[PDB]
């Protein structure tokens, strides 16, 4: 089994305040489950080859997704911003598989990714533990 | 817009203790978002015609989903038990649409549904406010 | 150190739905801290000789406290119901020490306690692991 | 009644990640209650003249308290850092009243307060809505 534990840091009140609005798990590698402990979020997966997505909404209406998973025994991550309301995590998560339009990010197996939304909000996923079955990463909004 | 607010009651420690492991939102009617307040869970949707799913796991390993939505301006609900680990809410939610194998439950527009899992855990969704745009329901595990 | 992990079961929707409105930790035995994980609540204490209180409020307005702790290396618990709004957990927790009017309950070192409020709500604390440093209990509202 | 809603921003992962370990409510003005909604924390009070404290612990072990309240119809706040494990919120909250050593901070009715801990962690409370019965503030760890 693999687990990915996330700590969420929000740096700039000017960007508004984000909260989780959805949490999905892909069905490969025997699925997996989200859990919360001590303000953190952990995705536990049955093995290598699946992932999960947290969607956040800010109190200013901004919608963004954070994807994390394990591909061929190495961690990966992605962030998608500027989402329309109909673009739920339920739509986003599957797009990393079956030759979908986000599969290329999963294939990169990134230990760190950052992007700034068109409206000017910075997002970063940075793994602090990058190897093994017990992975750790910070998610930073700014 | 429509919202559905859920209160979770767990009646029997013998059945183990359930916690949320996933929360999905379908993409129709401009999507929607889950939020938490005062121990309750609210699904807010852009209009009639979509839904969301909470998946729970008990500390005994039992996996079950609760679906709630609005179909043609009337509330609906469903409960699926005896799920395999790979049967995530990401798999379940879409099955209520596009002629999927659960669409028939959505079409019933039930204000109340109950089922007992094969392993003997009772589950009930019971709307306490059954009309209008601000719907309320109890989810009872037993 | 000692920890007490609580699972909260609510059996009867007719009594309303309770949520936590306060969490205190008494200052003996090097203090301690409340944490949440997988829908459970854990009080971690620096040793034997302290306690914490969760105050709950129902959406019908009922106020009650659950006290748990370790006294001379044995778990204890108590429940106070019929609380006025000014009787916060900050008032209640210290009443178990120093000639306070609730000290006698701590001294009993109960592994189980139940009481029914004047307004008709049953409450029970029942330890499921009653010995050692890693204690477990179910809190049942009925 | 008065309410104070807090949004918690954590800016610097190098300081560790803070989570709430205690929430107290002082017993004046008919008490009050903490609630959580959409990742925010609200203290609702029965009137002017009381307060509540959130104690936070970082995953590096740092202990700090944030106090907010209303004194003579004006908001107040304070932050205490460098706390020992025995200095729980239950000890700290009452020190703002009755000739306690922190009463002077309540009397200042600050709409903003900042302080840096001896171990180097910056903390700020900044009210974004500073008047009326529905107050709002950002709590910023840096
Ligand atoms: C072992 C491993 O990680 N296998 C995965 C498999 O589960 C699936 O996710 C696939 C999709 O292209 O990528 C890999 O082959
Ligand atoms: C107005 C309304 O609820 N429309 C819905 C539509 O959004 C879609 O969910 C459809 C699926 O069969 O069911 C209805 O037609
Ligand atoms: C070892 C132990 O539990 N010691 C406790 C001490 O910490 C304090 O709670 C005291 C108050 O009367 O009761 C006991 O002696
Ligand atoms: C109206 C108002 O805020 N009254 C408060 C009262 O409730 C109490 O806090 C007192 C303690 O010194 O300080 C003030 O007078
Ligand atoms: C600005 C923005 O959000 N771009 C995202 C990018 O971050 C992501 O890697 C890609 C694949 O999912 O989709 C979008 O291009
Ligand atoms: C025992 C059990 O969980 N049966 C479920 C039923 O409750 C649900 O309505 C149906 C459609 O989703 O799927 C399964 O038949
Ligand atoms: C009806 C009721 O709530 N009685 C409680 C009792 O449970 C508790 O043990 C005692 C000591 O704290 O005080 C209270 O009166
Ligand atoms: C370094 C530090 O935390 N100083 C605090 C200060 O912020 C606070 O206002 C005062 C009164 O409560 O006590 C503390 O010493």
XYZ file of C-alpha atoms and ligand atoms in Angstrom:
688
model
C 0.000 0.000 0.000
C 0.992 3.646 -0.538
C -0.108 6.764 1.331
C 0.270 10.471 0.562
C -0.168 12.964 3.416
C -0.863 16.622 2.601
C -0.443 19.779 4.702
C -2.301 22.815 3.349
C -0.664 26.240 3.709
C -2.519 29.400 2.696
C -0.199 32.388 2.473
C -2.109 35.426 1.229
C -5.510 36.598 2.525
C -5.694 38.793 -0.588
C -6.317 35.643 -2.650
C -9.307 34.753 -0.501
C -9.585 31.631 1.630
C -9.861 28.116 0.165
C -11.726 25.115 1.534
C -12.161 21.574 0.247
C -15.334 20.992 -1.797
C -14.714 17.509 -3.188
C -12.394 14.520 -2.755
C -12.156 11.711 -5.322
C -10.211 8.445 -5.618
C -9.417 6.636 -8.888
C -10.289 2.932 -9.167
C -6.905 1.450 -10.176
C -4.626 -0.408 -7.752
C -7.590 -1.505 -5.633
C -8.806 2.047 -5.038
C -8.067 4.054 -1.905
C -9.535 6.367 0.701
C -9.133 9.926 1.976
C -8.858 10.559 5.699
C -8.158 13.561 7.925
C -5.933 13.732 11.006
C -4.474 16.713 12.861
C -5.542 19.108 10.105
C -3.824 17.042 7.409
C -5.287 14.989 4.557
C -4.027 11.502 3.741
C -4.742 9.501 0.609
C -4.256 5.779 1.223
C -4.054 3.576 -1.876
C -4.089 -0.204 -2.372
C -0.873 -0.084 -4.386
C 1.047 1.824 -7.034
C -0.936 3.047 -10.032
C -3.795 5.173 -8.744
C -4.473 8.673 -7.411
C -6.940 11.108 -5.869
C -8.064 14.702 -6.296
C -8.973 17.457 -3.847
C -11.013 20.326 -5.286
C -10.912 23.646 -3.430
C -13.098 26.729 -3.684
C -12.073 30.115 -2.305
C -14.561 32.448 -0.633
C -13.985 34.573 -3.738
C -15.319 31.796 -5.990
C -12.058 30.485 -7.448
C -12.049 26.751 -8.252
C -8.869 24.653 -8.387
C -7.895 20.975 -8.151
C -4.910 19.223 -6.603
C -4.067 15.737 -7.874
C -1.672 13.363 -6.151
C -0.855 9.713 -6.818
C 1.762 7.045 -7.412
C 2.779 6.007 -10.932
C 5.130 3.052 -11.388
C 6.292 3.372 -7.773
C 7.112 7.095 -7.938
C 4.965 9.957 -6.619
C 3.271 12.417 -8.967
C 1.242 15.605 -8.686
C -0.635 18.236 -10.666
C -2.655 21.391 -10.141
C -5.484 22.594 -12.363
C -6.795 26.149 -12.015
C -9.420 28.354 -13.668
C -12.033 25.622 -13.438
C -15.653 26.165 -14.394
C -18.297 25.068 -11.883
C -19.204 22.042 -14.029
C -15.574 20.862 -14.036
C -15.813 18.842 -10.817
C -13.058 16.609 -9.411
C -15.262 13.767 -10.671
C -14.526 15.037 -14.190
C -10.854 15.869 -13.528
C -9.535 12.719 -11.834
C -10.319 10.304 -14.728
C -8.568 12.639 -17.166
C -5.191 11.434 -15.878
C -5.899 7.952 -17.244
C -7.055 6.077 -20.358
C -5.076 8.422 -22.608
C -6.883 11.437 -21.161
C -5.692 15.056 -21.549
C -3.895 15.147 -18.176
C -2.159 11.771 -18.373
C 1.052 13.537 -19.424
C 1.360 15.161 -15.990
C 1.004 11.834 -14.210
C 3.749 10.501 -16.490
C 6.135 13.266 -15.378
C 6.125 11.832 -11.838
C 6.806 15.287 -10.384
C 7.970 15.719 -6.790
C 7.082 19.400 -7.148
C 4.730 21.434 -9.329
C 3.654 25.057 -9.306
C 1.341 27.164 -11.438
C -0.350 30.549 -11.196
C -4.025 30.772 -12.139
C -5.067 33.314 -14.762
C -6.694 35.374 -12.002
C -3.341 35.528 -10.197
C -3.359 32.886 -7.458
C -0.161 30.878 -7.020
C -0.423 27.170 -6.253
C 2.329 24.710 -5.379
C 2.534 21.039 -4.497
C 5.881 20.143 -2.976
C 6.706 16.659 -1.696
C 8.805 16.781 1.470
C 9.148 13.008 1.574
C 9.713 11.861 -2.001
C 10.511 8.150 -1.741
C 8.992 5.046 -0.169
C 5.433 4.057 0.685
C 4.742 6.878 3.155
C 4.866 10.071 1.093
C 4.433 13.628 2.381
C 3.761 16.902 0.601
C 2.866 20.514 1.254
C 0.121 22.237 -0.717
C 0.679 25.993 -0.774
C -1.826 28.620 -1.938
C -0.516 32.140 -2.506
C -29.670 26.684 -6.857
C -30.478 23.668 -4.663
C -28.818 22.477 -1.463
C -29.065 19.218 0.486
C -27.908 19.191 4.121
C -27.118 15.861 5.797
C -26.897 14.904 9.484
C -25.116 11.602 10.137
C -26.401 9.387 12.963
C -24.549 6.217 13.946
C -26.644 3.997 16.192
C -24.792 0.762 16.916
C -21.130 0.486 17.979
C -21.386 -3.219 17.117
C -21.401 -2.257 13.425
C -18.127 -0.394 13.833
C -17.675 3.328 13.282
C -17.940 4.982 9.852
C -16.072 7.997 8.520
C -16.150 9.777 5.172
C -13.478 8.639 2.692
C -14.604 10.383 -0.492
C -17.009 13.079 -1.696
C -17.939 13.517 -5.368
C -20.137 15.914 -7.358
C -21.672 15.180 -10.779
C -21.141 17.712 -13.583
C -24.754 18.407 -14.644
C -26.657 21.559 -13.662
C -23.430 23.559 -13.406
C -21.866 21.197 -10.871
C -21.844 21.804 -7.126
C -19.740 21.674 -3.987
C -19.630 19.872 -0.642
C -19.141 21.863 2.540
C -19.181 21.125 6.270
C -20.757 23.183 9.055
C -21.612 22.272 12.645
C -20.920 18.586 12.006
C -23.269 18.489 9.011
C -22.532 18.049 5.303
C -24.176 20.221 2.658
C -24.221 19.612 -1.077
C -24.850 22.843 -2.982
C -25.801 22.474 -6.651
C -26.136 24.981 -9.503
C -29.662 23.802 -10.276
C -31.909 20.770 -10.585
C -30.453 17.738 -12.347
C -27.253 16.781 -10.558
C -26.080 14.982 -7.417
C -23.193 13.989 -5.165
C -21.912 10.931 -3.329
C -20.353 10.407 0.093
C -18.424 7.160 0.538
C -17.926 5.897 4.092
C -15.611 3.258 5.514
C -16.103 1.699 8.941
C -13.178 0.866 11.217
C -14.182 -2.727 10.460
C -13.510 -2.221 6.738
C -17.076 -1.959 5.438
C -17.510 0.316 2.400
C -20.801 2.032 1.531
C -21.977 5.017 -0.527
C -24.730 7.567 0.022
C -26.052 9.408 -3.034
C -28.239 12.496 -2.880
C -29.432 14.854 -5.608
C -32.301 16.656 -7.293
C -34.047 15.196 -10.347
C -36.650 17.284 -12.170
C -37.072 19.505 -9.103
C -37.635 16.663 -6.619
C -35.072 15.226 -4.188
C -33.685 11.715 -4.608
C -31.413 9.359 -2.697
C -29.763 5.948 -2.770
C -27.456 3.779 -0.701
C -25.026 1.210 -2.072
C -23.417 -1.323 0.267
C -21.004 -4.254 0.008
C -18.601 -2.244 -2.120
C -15.201 -3.543 -3.153
C -12.213 -1.262 -2.550
C -11.956 -0.468 -6.276
C -15.596 0.676 -6.362
C -14.892 4.290 -5.388
C -17.483 7.089 -5.304
C -15.773 8.233 -8.511
C -17.076 5.021 -10.102
C -20.482 5.099 -8.369
C -21.678 8.672 -8.952
C -21.640 8.525 -12.798
C -23.651 5.298 -12.706
C -26.797 7.294 -11.912
C -26.619 8.958 -15.332
C -26.221 8.234 -19.056
C -28.419 5.140 -18.776
C -26.153 3.697 -16.085
C -27.129 0.814 -13.762
C -28.236 3.093 -10.899
C -30.218 5.623 -12.928
C -33.434 3.841 -11.920
C -32.960 4.902 -8.290
C -32.513 8.541 -9.247
C -35.733 8.243 -11.260
C -37.654 7.072 -8.175
C -37.071 10.474 -6.538
C -37.207 8.887 -3.078
C -37.628 11.009 0.049
C -36.558 7.948 2.037
C -34.527 4.818 1.333
C -33.205 2.037 3.525
C -31.196 -1.113 2.913
C -29.248 -3.617 4.989
C -25.815 -4.672 3.745
C -25.112 -8.378 3.304
C -22.842 -8.228 6.357
C -25.767 -6.913 8.417
C -25.418 -3.132 8.674
C -28.610 -1.106 8.286
C -28.476 2.161 6.359
C -31.182 4.781 5.907
C -31.480 8.130 4.176
C -34.530 10.045 5.337
C -35.346 13.560 4.139
C -36.786 15.701 6.928
C -37.376 18.626 4.591
C -38.697 17.178 1.339
C -39.699 20.191 -0.757
C -38.136 23.442 -1.942
C -34.561 24.486 -2.651
C -33.207 23.942 0.871
C -33.491 20.202 1.490
C -32.562 18.348 4.684
C -32.006 14.673 5.409
C -30.742 12.328 8.087
C -28.308 9.539 7.256
C -28.591 6.725 9.790
C -26.171 3.806 10.188
C -27.306 0.888 12.338
C 1.792 9.572 28.281
C -1.842 8.459 28.117
C -4.349 8.829 25.307
C -8.113 8.449 25.236
C -9.781 8.046 21.844
C -13.527 8.678 21.575
C -16.017 7.535 18.933
C -19.289 9.482 18.994
C -22.520 7.589 18.262
C -25.836 9.449 17.959
C -28.799 7.068 17.988
C -31.991 9.127 17.947
C -32.592 11.973 15.467
C -35.616 13.019 17.543
C -33.222 14.276 20.230
C -31.608 16.574 17.669
C -28.062 16.445 16.338
C -25.145 17.253 18.648
C -21.908 18.924 17.620
C -18.815 19.855 19.628
C -18.744 23.504 20.764
C -15.747 23.474 23.133
C -12.766 21.264 24.060
C -10.772 21.894 27.239
C -7.677 20.273 28.726
C -6.880 20.452 32.436
C -3.382 21.563 33.399
C -2.046 18.682 35.530
C 0.255 15.904 34.324
C 1.974 18.314 31.928
C -1.280 19.120 30.123
C -2.378 17.502 26.887
C -4.010 18.147 23.540
C -7.141 17.226 21.596
C -6.794 15.943 18.037
C -9.176 14.562 15.423
C -8.524 11.594 13.137
C -10.930 9.603 10.970
C -13.957 11.130 12.705
C -12.691 10.246 16.189
C -11.419 12.497 18.970
C -8.221 11.809 20.890
C -7.089 13.415 24.131
C -3.351 12.922 24.550
C -2.019 13.630 28.036
C 1.514 14.027 29.377
C 0.857 11.445 32.069
C -1.669 10.239 34.621
C -3.533 12.907 36.564
C -5.336 15.101 34.077
C -8.429 15.221 31.864
C -10.322 17.067 29.177
C -13.912 18.000 28.455
C -15.909 18.075 25.234
C -18.998 20.263 25.378
C -21.730 19.401 22.871
C -24.712 21.421 21.705
C -27.667 19.921 19.845
C -29.413 21.795 17.049
C -32.339 21.944 19.465
C -30.196 23.887 21.934
C -29.367 21.205 24.508
C -25.981 21.601 26.225
C -24.013 18.720 27.752
C -20.409 17.926 28.711
C -18.413 14.704 28.474
C -15.362 14.476 30.741
C -12.609 11.868 30.325
C -9.219 11.478 31.996
C -6.804 9.309 33.942
C -6.625 9.395 37.746
C -3.924 7.365 39.491
C -3.347 5.334 36.316
C -7.009 4.390 35.850
C -9.439 5.916 33.352
C -12.368 8.024 34.523
C -15.397 9.670 32.937
C -18.502 11.727 33.699
C -21.378 13.384 31.880
C -23.133 16.575 32.950
C -26.449 17.507 31.318
C -28.942 20.348 31.669
C -26.203 22.958 31.378
C -26.998 26.649 31.159
C -25.303 28.674 28.395
C -22.893 30.257 30.901
C -21.786 26.839 32.186
C -19.044 26.378 29.605
C -16.521 23.506 29.561
C -14.053 26.047 30.928
C -16.273 26.249 34.035
C -16.988 22.513 34.195
C -13.521 20.961 33.736
C -11.984 22.548 36.873
C -14.938 21.417 39.024
C -13.432 17.910 38.961
C -10.421 19.119 40.970
C -9.668 21.061 44.222
C -12.744 20.419 46.379
C -14.857 21.205 43.316
C -18.391 19.759 43.346
C -17.542 17.066 40.745
C -14.255 15.776 42.193
C -16.023 12.685 43.553
C -16.793 11.492 40.012
C -13.106 11.560 39.017
C -12.237 9.552 42.136
C -14.609 6.752 41.059
C -12.407 5.903 38.064
C -15.420 4.659 36.094
C -14.930 2.568 32.952
C -18.562 3.328 32.083
C -21.091 6.034 32.946
C -24.634 6.802 31.833
C -27.217 9.457 32.645
C -30.427 10.822 31.173
C -30.927 14.586 30.963
C -34.021 16.231 32.464
C -35.158 17.013 28.900
C -34.988 13.301 28.064
C -31.669 12.705 26.289
C -29.699 9.597 27.242
C -25.897 9.782 27.329
C -23.328 7.052 27.875
C -19.548 6.858 27.987
C -18.312 3.288 27.698
C -14.620 2.412 27.548
C -13.938 -0.409 25.087
C -10.268 -0.536 26.033
C -10.111 -0.052 29.785
C -6.469 -0.670 30.687
C -3.067 0.560 29.515
C -1.887 3.876 28.088
C -3.947 3.764 24.903
C -7.555 3.920 26.091
C -10.678 3.817 23.893
C -14.311 4.729 24.562
C -17.641 5.106 22.794
C -19.749 8.175 23.554
C -23.401 7.401 22.864
C -26.231 9.944 22.639
C -29.689 8.394 22.672
C -25.312 38.218 20.394
C -21.867 38.681 18.847
C -19.925 36.374 16.562
C -16.282 36.339 15.539
C -15.328 34.291 12.482
C -11.667 33.368 11.984
C -9.819 32.307 8.830
C -6.463 30.649 9.528
C -3.578 31.353 7.131
C -0.255 29.517 7.497
C 2.477 31.107 5.387
C 5.743 29.303 6.099
C 6.063 25.494 6.045
C 9.498 25.853 7.667
C 7.760 26.851 10.912
C 5.857 23.561 10.863
C 2.122 23.041 10.487
C -0.232 24.166 13.261
C -3.475 22.472 14.229
C -6.050 23.319 16.897
C -5.637 21.333 20.137
C -8.119 23.129 22.418
C -11.020 25.613 22.212
C -12.317 27.375 25.325
C -15.180 29.794 25.937
C -15.237 32.156 28.911
C -18.396 32.209 31.014
C -19.504 35.868 30.929
C -22.190 37.327 28.665
C -24.156 34.069 28.832
C -21.257 32.042 27.422
C -20.920 31.050 23.790
C -19.917 28.248 21.462
C -17.292 27.433 18.840
C -18.406 26.082 15.469
C -16.675 25.227 12.199
C -17.968 25.999 8.708
C -16.173 25.893 5.358
C -12.767 25.668 7.047
C -13.402 28.713 9.248
C -13.951 28.943 12.998
C -16.764 30.954 14.559
C -17.135 31.962 18.193
C -20.749 32.879 18.890
C -21.333 34.736 22.152
C -24.506 35.576 24.067
C -23.536 39.234 24.207
C -20.662 41.632 24.791
C -18.272 40.771 27.604
C -16.823 37.360 26.887
C -14.210 35.591 24.760
C -12.738 32.303 23.652
C -9.294 30.867 23.051
C -7.952 28.549 20.371
C -4.741 26.778 21.322
C -2.609 25.578 18.404
C 0.233 23.079 18.311
C 2.660 22.767 15.403
C 3.970 19.397 14.263
C 7.307 20.660 15.561
C 5.824 20.980 19.048
C 5.310 24.744 19.321
C 2.354 25.822 21.482
C 0.510 29.130 21.078
C -2.891 30.618 21.945
C -5.125 33.024 20.038
C -7.694 34.907 22.125
C -10.658 36.791 20.635
C -13.685 38.428 22.246
C -15.833 41.510 22.702
C -15.274 43.958 25.565
C -17.731 46.825 26.021
C -19.052 46.304 22.482
C -15.625 46.440 20.821
C -13.615 43.477 19.537
C -10.370 42.451 21.215
C -7.589 39.954 20.560
C -4.255 38.686 21.874
C -1.667 36.038 21.086
C 0.488 34.219 23.627
C 3.489 32.206 22.414
C 6.203 30.124 24.060
C 3.657 28.174 26.087
C 4.661 25.203 28.201
C 2.620 21.990 27.841
C 0.857 22.625 31.170
C -0.230 26.115 30.073
C -3.441 24.964 28.412
C -6.129 27.273 26.977
C -8.097 26.445 30.115
C -5.315 28.174 32.089
C -4.856 31.030 29.613
C -8.451 32.144 28.922
C -9.239 33.127 32.546
C -6.018 35.174 32.806
C -7.759 37.873 30.743
C -10.234 38.506 33.579
C -10.207 39.240 37.370
C -6.830 40.916 37.932
C -5.291 38.159 35.811
C -1.931 39.007 34.206
C -3.456 39.380 30.702
C -6.490 41.539 31.540
C -4.724 44.623 30.161
C -4.736 43.134 26.648
C -8.529 42.698 26.674
C -8.929 46.317 27.794
C -7.017 47.537 24.715
C -9.808 46.366 22.396
C -7.327 45.786 19.565
C -8.560 45.325 15.994
C -5.116 43.920 15.165
C -2.279 42.273 17.088
C 1.032 40.707 16.102
C 3.909 39.061 17.945
C 6.868 36.837 17.154
C 7.591 33.838 19.378
C 11.027 33.366 20.961
C 11.514 30.354 18.659
C 10.918 32.601 15.643
C 7.286 32.124 14.593
C 5.314 35.225 13.622
C 1.622 35.420 14.536
C -0.986 38.014 13.632
C -4.679 38.508 14.309
C -6.203 41.086 11.989
C -9.909 41.914 12.011
C -11.254 42.463 8.494
C -14.674 43.447 9.803
C -14.074 45.561 12.887
C -17.511 46.882 13.835
C -20.976 45.437 14.441
C -22.163 42.097 15.805
C -20.764 39.938 13.015
C -16.994 40.339 13.293
C -14.366 38.745 11.025
C -10.615 38.236 11.416
C -7.667 36.549 9.738
C -5.235 34.592 11.905
C -1.849 34.454 10.194
C 1.063 32.192 11.159
C 4.341 33.125 9.502
C 2.495 -0.484 -11.086
C 1.777 0.770 -11.602
O 1.924 1.857 -11.049
N 1.006 0.585 -12.668
C 0.228 1.682 -13.265
C -1.195 1.201 -13.554
O -1.872 0.895 -12.329
C -1.967 2.275 -14.318
O -2.191 3.400 -13.463
C -1.172 2.721 -15.542
C -1.965 3.783 -16.310
O -1.222 4.183 -17.467
O 0.111 3.244 -15.142
C 0.909 2.198 -14.542
O 1.046 1.130 -15.486
C -34.270 19.944 -14.779
C -33.575 18.612 -14.469
O -33.534 18.170 -13.323
N -33.039 17.994 -15.515
C -32.311 16.722 -15.378
C -31.009 16.789 -16.177
O -30.134 17.774 -15.615
C -30.321 15.426 -16.176
O -29.856 15.127 -14.856
C -31.301 14.344 -16.624
C -30.595 12.986 -16.637
O -31.514 11.979 -17.075
O -32.442 14.308 -15.743
C -33.184 15.546 -15.839
O -33.577 15.736 -17.203
C -0.547 9.889 39.151
C -1.822 10.743 39.192
O -2.801 10.444 38.505
N -1.777 11.808 39.993
C -2.909 12.753 40.089
C -2.393 14.192 40.032
O -1.856 14.458 38.734
C -3.546 15.149 40.304
O -4.577 14.942 39.324
C -4.133 14.852 41.675
C -5.207 15.907 41.935
O -5.951 15.551 43.097
O -4.726 13.544 41.638
C -3.752 12.499 41.352
O -2.898 12.324 42.476
C -20.918 44.953 28.078
C -19.600 44.247 28.425
O -18.795 43.948 27.540
N -19.413 43.978 29.718
C -18.218 43.249 30.192
C -18.629 42.170 31.195
O -19.384 41.156 30.526
C -17.379 41.547 31.801
O -16.573 40.983 30.754
C -16.564 42.628 32.493
C -15.386 41.929 33.171
O -14.461 42.905 33.641
O -16.085 43.542 31.493
C -17.170 44.208 30.784
O -17.803 45.141 31.652
C -3.133 27.432 -15.584
C -3.472 25.993 -15.326
O -4.185 25.687 -14.375
N -2.954 25.090 -16.153
C -3.199 23.672 -15.965
C -1.874 22.985 -15.642
O -1.383 23.443 -14.396
C -2.054 21.472 -15.629
O -0.791 20.859 -15.459
C -2.709 21.027 -16.942
C -2.918 19.513 -16.998
O -3.844 19.093 -16.012
O -3.955 21.682 -17.097
C -3.834 23.083 -17.222
O -2.994 23.379 -18.314
C -27.591 -4.365 -0.791
C -27.315 -3.140 -1.613
O -26.457 -2.338 -1.258
N -28.046 -2.969 -2.710
C -27.874 -1.799 -3.552
C -29.158 -0.975 -3.514
O -29.367 -0.464 -2.211
C -29.090 0.155 -4.533
O -30.338 0.819 -4.570
C -28.733 -0.420 -5.909
C -28.649 0.663 -6.984
O -27.584 1.558 -6.719
O -27.495 -1.105 -5.830
C -27.536 -2.229 -4.977
O -28.545 -3.108 -5.417
C -28.762 14.733 35.307
C -27.289 15.022 35.298
O -26.772 15.491 34.282
N -26.596 14.766 36.416
C -25.154 14.992 36.449
C -24.395 13.713 36.762
O -24.394 12.907 35.606
C -22.949 14.011 37.161
O -22.293 12.814 37.523
C -22.918 14.957 38.347
C -21.479 15.259 38.754
O -20.803 15.976 37.734
O -23.571 16.183 38.062
C -24.770 16.208 37.301
O -25.861 16.666 38.045
C 6.315 36.741 23.056
C 4.892 36.625 23.522
O 4.226 35.643 23.189
N 4.409 37.602 24.301
C 3.021 37.559 24.750
C 2.245 38.779 24.283
O 1.963 38.624 22.911
C 0.928 38.923 25.046
O 0.267 40.107 24.650
C 1.194 38.995 26.539
C -0.116 39.140 27.310
O -0.920 37.981 27.166
O 1.867 37.840 27.012
C 2.897 37.234 26.243
O 4.141 37.301 26.878
